[PDB]
């Protein structure tokens, strides 16, 4: 799709490889509690 073509265009001027790994949670993720204590941890996308 769109972003894939963008990264391909990036590759042709940066000389680097890639191995796509799709998300294991299916979410963008925000600041949420760790569900074990008062600490807040990242979930969803940005935690990966």
């Amino acid at each position: 799709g769109f972003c894939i073509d963008l990264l391909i265009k990036l590759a042709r001027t940066m000389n680097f490889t890639y191995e796509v790994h799709l998300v294991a949670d299916g979410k963008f993720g925000t600041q949420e509690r760790v569900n074990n204590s008062n600490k807040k941890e990242w979930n969803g996308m940005m935690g990966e």
């Binding site: 509690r33 204590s37 008062n38 600490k39 807040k40």
Partner: protein, 51 residues
């Protein structure tokens, strides 16, 4: 370290206003200690010193 870690991990709005680490065992530093004491003034302050 414990104070900073529990402040950062907490979701509550705790705002630390500087850390005072003046040493009373030094010589001729009483004026500097008084200056630091005058500079710092907060409603809530914690202390860590000997008796």
């Amino acid at each position: 370290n414990k104070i900073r870690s529990t402040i950062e991990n907490s979701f509550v709005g705790w705002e630390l206003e500087e850390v005072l680490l003046l040493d009373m065992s030094l010589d001729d530093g009483d004026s500097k200690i008084q200056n630091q004491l005058k500079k710092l003034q907060s409603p809530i302050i914690l202390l860590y010193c000997t008796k």
